[PDB]
Amino acid sequence: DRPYSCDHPGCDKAFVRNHDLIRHKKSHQEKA
Ligand SMILES: [Zn+2]
Numbered sequence: 001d002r003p004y005s006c007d008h009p010g011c012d013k014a015f016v017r018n019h020d021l022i023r024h025k026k027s028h029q030e031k032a
Helices: 017-026
Strands: none
Touching: none
């Protein structure tokens, strides 16, 4: 049931694994 469904504003990428959410969540940050 998508144990990793990030819910960040402007998001649109579901996940099933864990690390993915970790490498994906840190993306909502980015520099600049
Ligand atoms: Zn996200």
